[PDB]
Amino acid sequence: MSLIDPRAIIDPSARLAADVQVGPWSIVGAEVEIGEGTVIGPHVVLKGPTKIGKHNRIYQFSSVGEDTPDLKYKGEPTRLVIGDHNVIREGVTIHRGTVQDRAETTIGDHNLIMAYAHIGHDSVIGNHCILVNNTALAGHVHVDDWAILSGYTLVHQYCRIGAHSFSGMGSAIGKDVPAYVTVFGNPAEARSMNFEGMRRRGFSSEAIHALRRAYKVVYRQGHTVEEALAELAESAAQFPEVAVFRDSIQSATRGITR
Amino acid sequence: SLIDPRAIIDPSARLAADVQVGPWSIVGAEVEIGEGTVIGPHVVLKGPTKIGKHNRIYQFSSVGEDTPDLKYKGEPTRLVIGDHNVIREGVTIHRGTVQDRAETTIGDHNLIMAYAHIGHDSVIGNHCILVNNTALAGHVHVDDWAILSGYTLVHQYCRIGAHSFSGMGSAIGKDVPAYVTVFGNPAEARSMNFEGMRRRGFSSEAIHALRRAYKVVYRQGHTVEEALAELAESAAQFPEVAVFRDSIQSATRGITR
Amino acid sequence: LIDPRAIIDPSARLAADVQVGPWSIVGAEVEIGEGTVIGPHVVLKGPTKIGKHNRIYQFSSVGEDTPDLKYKGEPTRLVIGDHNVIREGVTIHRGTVQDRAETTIGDHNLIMAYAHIGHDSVIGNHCILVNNTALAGHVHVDDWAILSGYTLVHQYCRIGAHSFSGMGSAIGKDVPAYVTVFGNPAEARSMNFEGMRRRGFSSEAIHALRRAYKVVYRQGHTVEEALAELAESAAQFPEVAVFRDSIQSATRGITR
Ligand SMILES: O=C(O)CCC(=O)c1cccc2ccccc12
Ligand SMILES: O=C(O)CCC(=O)c1cccc2ccccc12
Ligand SMILES: O=C(O)CCC(=O)c1cccc2ccccc12
Ligand SMILES: O=C(O)CCC(=O)c1cccc2ccccc12
């Protein structure tokens, strides 16, 4: 399934794999590597150094592997790494790393990035995440697996979005969102847990109840987070699902969304 | 000539004789374009899609793409746009899903401003304005003359009533009755669009009957069941109040309060 | 320098070393100054002047007509100065005859991806408009202002020198010089001291502006009493005169 439209500009240092497609008026820039079966639409701008894995799909008007704009981050080389089976919709902007942080922006596998979403310098996205239309990761954002950020979710620099978490549309996130937690509003506020997400992805009823207890332990009982960690220790040893919640509290860099 | 020679026209596309297409635009398989329509440069049209007459579609617009929505599995769904519409810079419009009616529908005399998004299965009527970055998530019904201010977000299945108004940055999760003004995240009911009613030449008598109708729904501690009973009389007298009352009766997600 | 896949209207006015990328349009009555790089997939429309050492990124539409129902095809203008960065998919509309028939941008401005500069807006120098910031129309942004991501500004609002909006701010009244605003609707929080240090303000000016803020926001004064009370400090510190003038010139009212 290989088709390179001759109206595309492929840099001589660019590398295409088996069954790669590139649509008309797209740019595949110097030091861009595209893996097996990846389909690039028309009017795409790819810049490097960038590595894209297998069976990805990048839509028109997207700018993937651009430099972060503030000419105060003005160092090179900086990397973008994209895994496999990712969908990047119309007009998505993805920026490479900065030498004054990770020197890399990282995206894993099976992610859906919907139209006009922004992924800022040095962000890390895991696997099976959904960033709905116009979601903006300001920079240095960590989104763990199965997270869903609803349309127009803004995320401040350095925030961690926990596994299976959920933001409502127009949420503005200024602190870490623990794993499984649902946040709404500007500024973002914890509501409940993504119980629906746990169910759809086959979480045991015991796991789900231990996470309902785990939520109370952290949010409702007036405990210091050290007190909360010690309280969760046992349920965390029983339930890998609770340990994921505990780990997100523990590693929270400047507080949790309350 | 009127079709730029740097444009890609699929052989299966049907274009009325005076249609213009700018350079580096794509008119995909099973795209129909009616008389007097101008497609600018850098436009992607995908089908199956019917665009009517005297429309204008600006650079960087994606009209007729598949929804990324997980429940779409490549079914042969449709997009219909009527006549006299303006689609500005970078607008996205997605085709329908078979789970609903298999069609995204836009009417006539609509102004859809830059980076607006019209989600799978949405229905827009006539003379609507979607300001910059308005996003209809999917299955959204926007009735005639509705104005959605910039960065207005609309949840799946919401109904936006005729002559309604949203303030900028409004996040709508519940239905907006006809005539109602909503503001904020989450959206809150403030009043009725009296400025829009006067702009359209409504009668003093119809405006007054709608002023009183708002009070009955929103300011008398009535349940909606009770409010609907109380509106029956004035709804029987005034078509404008019938439209308001019908929008509440048809408000499946509940009404914005 | 001019990619042969670009379209340059004959009536365009490109200076010696201007670069235009592939599949970009430099339309009629579009002037571009020395050292300016037009990226690929850019649309320029005129009447428009673009100064020197500018960078305009892909999928930008610079100089389009406002879709505003009050515009009607008149030959309104867009003027951009020097050393500006206009990022991916930015929209800049030309003016209307209802105001000064001109949209204006000064020097050293950073306008990030999908930002919108509506008809008749006036941006000064060394401003940052972060991603998806929107100036609805007739918005004045004075020098060194920072508007964070998805800041929305209602028509006619003035954004004062060194002011700061937090992400998702929705501004419906003027923001005085130096003031930090957040939320929808925007509310005043504090002053932009990081901005004052970035400018090498003396601690004396920074202390005077710290005082000036309290006099306006924290001492239950009316604007007029605040303006009267600020005359001493304003006559002494130009920095405070900037604060004071920005409140004096807000006949709409100030973000509270
Ligand atoms: O069809 C898509 O939208 C994805 C791949 C693509 O853009 C493409 C690849 C090769 C040749 C083409 C000729 C015309 C239009 C698109 C293409
Ligand atoms: O279900 C929820 O809570 C929000 C739904 C939502 O954010 C969404 C979904 C799909 C496409 C969209 C496009 C634009 C804006 C929002 C969306
Ligand atoms: O709080 C912070 O750290 C971010 C401040 C902000 O709004 C921002 C800054 C830089 C790039 C961005 C891209 C998209 C959205 C927001 C931003
Ligand atoms: O807020 C006002 O002053 C007008 C209402 C509005 O939302 C608007 C109007 C025109 C262009 C716009 C561009 C971007 C965002 C908002 C607008």
Numbering used by the authors:
A (entry chain A): 1 to 258
B (entry chain B): 2 to 258
C (entry chain C): 3 to 258
Question: How did the manuscript describe this experimental structure?
Answer:
LpxA and LpxD are functionally and structurally similar, sharing a homotrimer architecture and conserved active site features, especially in the acyl-chain binding pockets that reside in the dimer interface of the β-helix trimer core. Herein we report the discovery of several small molecules that bind to both P. aeruginosa LpxA and LpxD with μM affinity, identified using a targeted structure-based methodology that utilizes molecular docking, surface plasmon resonance (SPR) bioanalysis, and high-resolution X-ray crystallography.
For compound 1, the complex structure with LpxA was solved at 2.10 Å resolution. Two modes of binding conformations can be identified in terms of the relative location of the carboxyl group, with minor variations in the positioning of the carboxyl group seen within each bind mode. In the first binding mode (exemplified by pose 1), the carboxyl group is within hydrogen bonding distance to the Gln157 main chain and His156 side chain. In the other binding mode (exemplified by pose 2), the ligand’s carboxyl group is positioned near the Gln157 side chain, forming a hydrogen bond. The rest of compound 1, including the carbonyl group and the naphthalene ring, is placed identically in all poses. Notable intermolecular interactions include a hydrogen bond between the carbonyl oxygen and the Gly151 main chain. Additionally, the naphthalene ring forms multiple non-polar interactions with residues His118, Asn133, Val132, Ala136, Ala138, and Met169. Among these, Met169 is the so-called “hydrocarbon ruler” that ensures the length of the incoming acyl chain substrate is no longer than 10 carbon atoms. Aside from the acyl-chain binding pocket, compound 1 was found in a second binding pocket outside the active site at the dimer interface, where a second copy of the substrate UDP-GlcNAc was also identified in the previously published LpxA-substrate complex structure. The naphthalene ring of compound 1 forms non-polar interactions with Leu3, Gly23 and Pro24, whereas the carboxyl group establishes favorable electrostatic interactions with Arg57.
